[PDB]
Amino acid sequence: LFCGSMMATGKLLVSYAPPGADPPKKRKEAMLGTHVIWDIGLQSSCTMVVPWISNTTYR
Amino acid sequence: GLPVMNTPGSNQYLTADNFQSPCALPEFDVTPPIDIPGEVKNMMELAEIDTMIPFDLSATKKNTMEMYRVRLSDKPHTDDPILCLSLSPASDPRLSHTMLGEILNYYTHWAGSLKFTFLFCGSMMATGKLLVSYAPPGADPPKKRKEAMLGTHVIWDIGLQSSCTMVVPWISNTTYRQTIDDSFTEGGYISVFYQTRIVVPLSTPREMDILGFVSACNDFSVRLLRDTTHIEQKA
Amino acid sequence: GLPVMNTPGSNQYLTADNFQSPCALPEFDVTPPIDIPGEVKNMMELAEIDTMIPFDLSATKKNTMEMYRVRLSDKPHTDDPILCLSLSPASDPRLSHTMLGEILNYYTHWAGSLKFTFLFCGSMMATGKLLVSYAPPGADPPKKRKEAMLGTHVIWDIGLQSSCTMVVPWISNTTYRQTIDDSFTEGGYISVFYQTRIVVPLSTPREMDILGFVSACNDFSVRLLRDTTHIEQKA
Amino acid sequence: GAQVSSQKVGAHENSSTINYTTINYYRDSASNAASKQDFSQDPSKFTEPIKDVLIKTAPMLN
Amino acid sequence: GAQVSSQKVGAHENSSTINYTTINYYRDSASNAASKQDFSQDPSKFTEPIKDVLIKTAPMLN
Amino acid sequence: EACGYSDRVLQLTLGNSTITTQEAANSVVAYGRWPEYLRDSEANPVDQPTEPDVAACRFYTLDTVSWTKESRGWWWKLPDALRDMGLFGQNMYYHYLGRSGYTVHVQCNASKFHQGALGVFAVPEMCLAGDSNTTTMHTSYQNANPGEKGGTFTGTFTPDNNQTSPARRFCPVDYLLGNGTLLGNAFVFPHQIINLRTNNCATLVLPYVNSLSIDSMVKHNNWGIAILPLAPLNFASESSPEIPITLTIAPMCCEFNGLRNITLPRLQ
Amino acid sequence: EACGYSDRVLQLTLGNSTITTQEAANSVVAYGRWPEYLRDSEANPVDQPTEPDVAACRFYTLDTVSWTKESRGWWWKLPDALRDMGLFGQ
Amino acid sequence: AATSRDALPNTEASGPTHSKEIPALTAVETGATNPLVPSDTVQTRHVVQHRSRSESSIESFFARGACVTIMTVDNPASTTNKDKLFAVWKITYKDTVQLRRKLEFFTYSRFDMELTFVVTANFTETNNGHALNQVYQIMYVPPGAPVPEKWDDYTWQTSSNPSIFYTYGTAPARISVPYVGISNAYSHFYDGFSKVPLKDQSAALGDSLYGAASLNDFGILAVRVVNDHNPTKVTSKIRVYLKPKHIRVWCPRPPRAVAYYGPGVDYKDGTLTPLSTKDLTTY
Amino acid sequence: AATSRDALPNTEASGPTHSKEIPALTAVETGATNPLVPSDTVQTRHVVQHRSRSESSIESFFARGACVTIM
């Protein structure tokens, strides 16, 4: 949820990277996995779904 | 042998002629066509596409990204012209080099209705009302809103809808006009003015640019194919 | 006389033209045809027949019965090439003079799938496993089994069935390739290697020759008939 | 094998459709003359390449 | 006596099979032009001249 | 939709990536043709093709560039720009031939008090002009292909004078579309305009365009992405304002032929 | 086959690669189970899977080792052994 | 169904308007062009339209023979020390500007080619001797075939190559050629190279020209005077007229705005200022 | 019935193989040439063939005026 002023615009990148590799420290790497490019406007909030992606039936 | 008699034109080479002729590569396995996107069937199709107008062809702005930008301002109301332009699609320096003007220069005659669309590239906080005019030939070319208002025009109100289109109707004495500057086949005058005035709040730019585009209406056509002056080979 | 008008091309002689003409020997009793064996209807038929490749065109072997023999040996396994060859059917010295290459040089363009068959002329007591490879253009021409193994290939196992055929599939960007050396229409690389190693018992020759043959698949064709460079008349 | 067609008649004499006869002498299409019997198409793919079809009477942006 | 045939059409104009008309003026076949209407045949007599027909999926030598 | 739906608000989803936008001016589909796989009737290379699907047909975000009063414009080439992007670049280099469409999403937001117009153009076979007046068509492979970072346009043509050791690179002049033709006419080409007062971005869906059914992705670039300032950036009163232009692109219905060892280009 | 066919002579073809053998002792299919894709009824990870097909499902030839009177034996692990093999390792 | 020569749409009678419908208002940002017509922004009368786009069709636009090159050959006196001059021209539409600019209004093209040859000869020396009627041999040498090195060497036999034996003073020679491209369509522009520079391999080796495909697209035209050396020298010129028939074009482009500089899109200093001075507010 | 200018045979879609059938293997000694096609040794896609052998026919190959002497 974006609690900033109405006059304030912006575009954020929400990312999800399944295990096994170097934990993302830069947009470049994060962009390569499951993600959502959130555009700030009338619709105050943005939802990113972290899909059930695992080797074992349960964690 | 069948009795025949040769007539004038015999053995001559008409660059524009349309006959059959022996194939230098008989039985040649021709490579089939693939459904390539963007196929064109008629030059007029290109003339119907909006192309940006180089309005400000002034000594310093011409031949630079700037000639395309018609500058406006939050300044006080004035009945004076923002920009004056002659309806000579193929000959007038500001229209002659646009996709439309360029195709027109491959032809001797032009006919039909044109349409001029103006795009307001100023800030969202900036309001205003402009007057786009078209005055058919025969009289004193409009130099003041008063005169321009008296002919074919459109009062453009700036808002959500970024752009405004003014249609210059096919109004002429001759069935076709000449692709060159000619008193007899003259098209008239296209001028733009401040209906009220560009108004902006504080913390906002008092000056903005408006882009202009020209394209041909579905009633538009050209004839008498010819070689253009827009390109040459001195040597 | 019927009014006629002569057009461009009149009275000209097009070596490739196809018209009728007066017979110098009217009513001449022509000798009928007899059902002679071995009749051909299309040059491509000859291209589909296996013809021996002059692989070893080295300074001393070239232009001698030896250029046809690719020598192998019971020596230890090595990832190094037995023989490297470019997919230029008409231009590459080793292919240009084979029945296929020769017919290709009478044409400007070639297309379709080729097939390379290798014959093991060593002794019955001699076993072995070779790797025949084909690498489509655009990358570093294979110099080691490792790289060659990564592209189109066939692991040939030597036994009762004397020979092994590797099909070089029609894999190209253009609908047709040029019958000359050309970066743009390049075919790629054909290389051969030791999968394991030629093994032989005692009292047996540790060295043997393998013959290689090239021919065109039924999807193969040529176009744009032309004069070849493989023969001349200086004087 | 004669191909008979109609001439779009311009300036008519003080003299019903008029026709012209055409016959192909060669076996290769390339040898043939230009029919000029060509088709027009709607500029859409260039003047309105937008995903969501546009209605001129309504607001382009909504 | 006119002989009408079909042209295998390559590059088509923005303009249904197209035909070409042919007529023989001379009494002697030799005087005639080349039809180019020729036939293909299977290479078999040269690529597989062997007595016992061969099946590619099976061992050539058995 | 009386239900809510609108031209300005879109949601694009490819593979594991999703893009949202509340301020769009609709979307453009080049020549009215939506990207598609190579048909049997039009196919050339006989071998079973490699279709990466979701692994490559997803959204890659290139390095974000900065838009200022001084900027003359930016340019990119496809597939060149995506050559180093995850599984798509890997499959492109491992194969002799390859074909692909693209969903180009140019992002650039600001404020109701900012001014400016970005002319975003998709140009087929975007051949650019070189920096030399003594020689021609001389621009080196390394310089003609900037990769992800792309190149930029110049307000002025300044000829490479070092005859001995030539820069061997492009001199794309803005008002001439970097190629000998007037910018004002670039609009005959598939495009969209990013007018700060009207919209955050530009979405162009590009089909595989070319004289051939499939070609060499490494030797040849099918599409050229040109971004020029039709109307200069401007804010409140600040003499030197600035706003980012982020470019996100996704390969589509893409497929590859002629598999072999990986191609290691001399990119420097 | 009276036609010629035999247990010792086989031809295996995967993607752009083909293997031939004139001296084989037939072939073995582990636990009588032929390799297969992950079924919906047995699937776990919800995201659209990546199936390289011919690009990875082909024949990779590893470094050739030497067998001698002294050799005690060799070992490999999958997928480890193919980790650096073209599009499959990628 | 709509024919290139069908009459354009009739203008319909339109009256006054006071509605919520806004045709005049729009948003060029979307990439689209407002499909407006006179009746949308003004009161129009009913007009039966007779005008046609017949002459502006792709075929009609190019349906004209255009000069692509001027070949120079000759026939000297046996004695002269200098060689009998025979012409060799690499076939193309770029040696001249007019036709090239027209074809270039588009990215890709497809068409049967009609080549017409206009041959003119003349005397070079203030001599007075004469010369018998000349017979020219225009030989087409496709990429790969033995290119002639002498006005009279073995290659002129043309056993396989197509040759046109033109007789001076007779109706200009003419032949037709199919769509011969190794691609599904001619490429007016190639944004790439014929070679891939491989690291692992020497710089100079992987190098090639920008925008240039087949080093030898369509071979060459080799012209000579068949007649033997004549005491009095006669120089001849062969003008080649190229006409694109049964033509198709794809992906439109903005016309060449500045002086051509070589076979590519390259422009040259001092030629980049096409447009002339004209004030914003001056008719 | 097959015309010199008829389109060559279409390439048929071919999948993987683990069989007793050995197309790749043969014996040139017999005097014959292996009738193989891409789909026999590799995995192929379906391709509609438009190419022709029209220009390579006996008549087409010689259908050109050639210089045999200069008198």
Ligand SMILES: CCCCCCCCCCCCC/C=C/[C@@H](O)[C@@H](N)CO
């Ligand atoms: C006896 C006369 C024979 C004449 C032989 C002419 C055959 C060669 C014609 C080639 C046609 C080239 C037309 C222009 C193609 C260029 O645009 C290419 N760079 C584009 O692909």
